[PDB]
Symmetry: D2
Amino acid sequence: MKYMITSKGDEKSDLLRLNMIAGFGEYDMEYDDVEPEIVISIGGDGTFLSAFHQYEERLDEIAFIGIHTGHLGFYADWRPAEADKLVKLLAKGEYQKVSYPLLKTTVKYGIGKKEATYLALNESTVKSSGGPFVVDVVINDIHFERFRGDGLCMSTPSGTTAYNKSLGGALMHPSIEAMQLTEMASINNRVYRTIGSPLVFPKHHVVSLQPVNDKDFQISVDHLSILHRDVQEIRYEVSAKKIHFARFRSFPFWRRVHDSFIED
Amino acid sequence: MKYMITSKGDEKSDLLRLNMIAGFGEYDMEYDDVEPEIVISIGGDGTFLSAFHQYEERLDEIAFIGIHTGHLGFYADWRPAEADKLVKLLAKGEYQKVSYPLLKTTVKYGIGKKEATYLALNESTVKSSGGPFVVDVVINDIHFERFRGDGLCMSTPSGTTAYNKSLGGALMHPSIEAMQLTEMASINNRVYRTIGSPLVFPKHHVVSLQPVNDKDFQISVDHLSILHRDVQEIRYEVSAKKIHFARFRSFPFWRRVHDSFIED
Amino acid sequence: MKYMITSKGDEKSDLLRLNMIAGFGEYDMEYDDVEPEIVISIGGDGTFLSAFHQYEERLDEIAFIGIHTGHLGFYADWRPAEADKLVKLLAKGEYQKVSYPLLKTTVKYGIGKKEATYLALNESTVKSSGGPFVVDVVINDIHFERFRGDGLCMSTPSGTTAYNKSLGGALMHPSIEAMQLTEMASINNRVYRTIGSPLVFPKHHVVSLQPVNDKDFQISVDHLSILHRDVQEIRYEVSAKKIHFARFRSFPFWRRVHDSFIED
Amino acid sequence: MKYMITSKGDEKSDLLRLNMIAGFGEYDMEYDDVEPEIVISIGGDGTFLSAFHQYEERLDEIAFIGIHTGHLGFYADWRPAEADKLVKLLAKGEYQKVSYPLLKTTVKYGIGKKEATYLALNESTVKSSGGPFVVDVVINDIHFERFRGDGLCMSTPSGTTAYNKSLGGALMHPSIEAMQLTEMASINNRVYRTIGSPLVFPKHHVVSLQPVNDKDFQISVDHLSILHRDVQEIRYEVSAKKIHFARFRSFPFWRRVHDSFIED
Ligand SMILES: CCNC(=O)NC[C@H]1O[C@@H](n2c(C#CCN(C)C[C@H]3O[C@@H](n4cnc5c(N)ncnc54)[C@H](O)[C@@H]3O)nc3c(N)ncnc32)[C@H](O)[C@@H]1O
Ligand SMILES: CCNC(=O)NC[C@H]1O[C@@H](n2c(C#CCN(C)C[C@H]3O[C@@H](n4cnc5c(N)ncnc54)[C@H](O)[C@@H]3O)nc3c(N)ncnc32)[C@H](O)[C@@H]1O
Ligand SMILES: CCNC(=O)NC[C@H]1O[C@@H](n2c(C#CCN(C)C[C@H]3O[C@@H](n4cnc5c(N)ncnc54)[C@H](O)[C@@H]3O)nc3c(N)ncnc32)[C@H](O)[C@@H]1O
Ligand SMILES: CCNC(=O)NC[C@H]1O[C@@H](n2c(C#CCN(C)C[C@H]3O[C@@H](n4cnc5c(N)ncnc54)[C@H](O)[C@@H]3O)nc3c(N)ncnc32)[C@H](O)[C@@H]1O
């Protein structure tokens, strides 16, 4: 079917891309980067995240595949030595699709500057634009805590092995439709109090961050960081949208975790 | 309907129990501790856990209610001052039922000593019977890590605010059908390696602990600790069974967490 | 002797300052903010830190005193209700001096842009100027680790109850001449490895951070954050300089910690 | 001079011991395990700790050396391949001595059962003898916190890379005369509160644990675990005694840490 290939842009990834395009030319495979049905990412997880964001508006029409030309990337299923096998298997259509949950972030502004919405495959984080970070954390309209510290991170299940992990979060199997909120260096004393623990939320729960004094925030979505001014609310919820992977063999999540953090 | 009341056994809980029995006598409420349909626990969370284990074989026929005579217990919905209101509301049948997931622990032995199975509302933990604790951790038959340290804790969602929390685990909303594995003081050096992070598993995943040298273990299920000798395997999975609570008003989990850890 | 008083600048602190100046006028106390021998800070710990930095070049000639007009500040020994008692005790010279260690930070530049040195009472932190933070950590010329993550924090003993604490550091009695290095969200996987644990260094050990790719860093010293470009090295060591407090009664550090974090 | 050699007791360590004894016989070296002046440990850190405790009453007359026949032990300076070089260097007296601090634990009993004192090279820990662990923590007679949880660990500087590290403690250079207290799974909620952070104490500070209800405790000193009944007090302080190592070359502590936890 229609496919496209993104490359990290080093010599190794560019050459692999050109060789895969040549292999696909031996099948009924049209290169089409406007409306692909298969998106192959050649690089690392950053390359994969960029491919995801390039096609975030057609996620229900696309199956993603990642090839890692460096160390095993987490969203990668293939080493470069297997590209020819992948071309063949993709050509014949011999693959199941697996879906991972995504995170929706809504940023609301004052002075009628509307809403912006973002989709995350790894996480969305929030920090101050300089000066202390203080937000009220509201869970399904329940005032839960006032957070003072460096920032907050809201992770998808597949993101839990990324920034979330470094912040002390739990690793969550991606079949669980959830998001996980972790703290970045909260202050805790007789006067300031947060929960400390990571929090795991199901689908349909809404976590709202509400400014207390300063209204300017640096908001990251995967590796894109943007300054938002005059923020009234940041709202997190598990997205109704999902990312779909083409799978050709068993590579269970927990084996992926083992291979990335324990030994490989 | 049929009900019974357990008491922590101090003067305050015993007297409240007797007064509630008197109130129930003004309605079509039969006291029956063999086959109750409502089980009221008066005490703390330990009292509640004991009531759960007293009726673990009739969990699908019973709705539980907890009254806390000391500090707000986590499984408690009522203060003692509200007992009369509770009697009335229970008598009229004005209540919805909510269910929390449970944890199944299976202990397999050698020399054909069969299997023992246990159900946990908070968690199941494992430690050595003395001497170093070393187990292989096998996830759905995938060898994931060799754990060396003080022990491991596998928590239900409602247990995540208990021992799990003290071990660095995430707090998980109990609508999520999952179990969470946390480490107790793992050794990590150039030679010994564990994941460190808490792990959250969905229903149908099986986590098996397999002895490496010593085969004797202290296994806790809620607050019951038992020595198991000649263990071949400890297996954890989310149970098919659930605990049911009678609910008469809104007391959302996240508000319960706020009230217990942030301020109340 | 010569004294001056700094104020947070709210009505309460300004009025207390004016009343203390009036009280001091009844003694042989000259107000002198060029060469004070006693520096009184009225406000919070931020006010105290600012007073310290205002006189960092005369630290061996000055004894500091802090009054907290809000919640108990850590560098505060007095509540506002005790100001008159403090005026009297200071006037008569009835006080011992206690010293806390300080942290020296040296920033070296390329293209012969020399060195800048800074003194910290709480801590010095380093983050990237945007983009990933990666430094080699060199301890007494021994390459110890390559750190990749959000940043690093080097704390004095009295700073260990501040940012250091939120980052998981140990609280250290200030009689110990040491500095403590904590991590901010390090990445750890099969490929990237850091020590994880806080590190405590004695006097005369030098910890050098050396850029790997990007050479621009945001360096904080207490609450002053500065962008440094074209950095070749950041060097941390326990300073030869000390801060001196005037003490009029026993307020042991561990009681101060209890009162600030446990109960008061 | 007088020396002795302890062995882990496997074939490799026993044979190395016999070969070193043969080498020492070519010098003015008397084997004497009653009053040695050099104690060589061949094995791992457990073997070294046992050698330390075998001669804890002559610590000021002995210099210790460790050979690791397995993975690099932390108290080991030599690989087995270097034994012959070590024999030679020891024979000629070409070595400096370095000292590490030690931990004194005093256990006081009721019903006039006196005091027991213990010396630790790694740490002393305390847990309940079964049933909940609850102690008041008193620092220099100041009531600091009531600890409820699994236990407490008090570490020497060289012990900070051992159990202390797994409990989240700081790694401390052994030139610092200090002890470090870490928590094992403390309960923290609206009702129960501990400091959480590791605490680092200088020489001459005394940390006293005082029972609240149960008076029976399991107390570990290095790898020796003993049940103490009817305890009135456990007291920790940095010992006046030190352990002395024979050093023949530079192996800095921080390089030792790097080699054990980062890469080697
Ligand atoms: C230390 C700076 N970051 C990196 O070096 N990331 C590159 C590494 O991260 C792995 N990586 C990525 C990525 C990716 C592409 N990133 C450039 C963006 C992502 O950087 C994460 N992030 C940011 N601050 C972090 C911090 N202080 N600590 C840890 N992470 C941090 C955050 O999740 C963001 O989205 N995604 C996954 C995943 N889902 N599971 C496991 N590993 C994964 C990938 O293979 C490479 O090993
Ligand atoms: C420190 C010793 N334990 C206690 O003082 N527990 C009594 C406290 O625990 C609260 N509690 C209980 C209980 C209950 C009844 N327990 C006697 C048994 C339970 O003790 C837990 N546990 C054991 N080791 C622990 C440790 N080192 N650190 C933290 N916990 C530890 C473990 O989950 C076990 O099942 N269940 C919940 C819950 N699901 N969510 C929130 N709080 C809860 C309850 O209100 C009281 O505040
Ligand atoms: C959360 C933002 N910071 C604050 O709200 N600080 C204000 C609080 O901090 C207390 N405070 C101060 C201060 C002070 C004055 N600061 C404006 C500057 C100091 O903010 C520290 N810092 C920065 N990022 C932090 C983070 N993410 N988490 C924790 N701290 C963080 C850092 O050490 C810096 O120097 N010094 C001490 C001390 N030595 N021991 C105990 N408490 C102390 C003081 O009473 C007030 O309770
Ligand atoms: C996990 C069980 N313990 C072990 O496997 N210890 C054997 C390991 O420990 C290294 N080891 C030893 C030892 C030694 C000899 N031990 C049998 C006794 C010591 O076991 C420590 N301990 C107990 N519970 C622990 C836990 N849950 N987590 C981490 N440690 C734990 C505790 O400090 C005790 O004294 N001393 C040092 C040192 N000062 N610095 C660095 N590594 C060191 C040594 O090379 C081997 O790699």
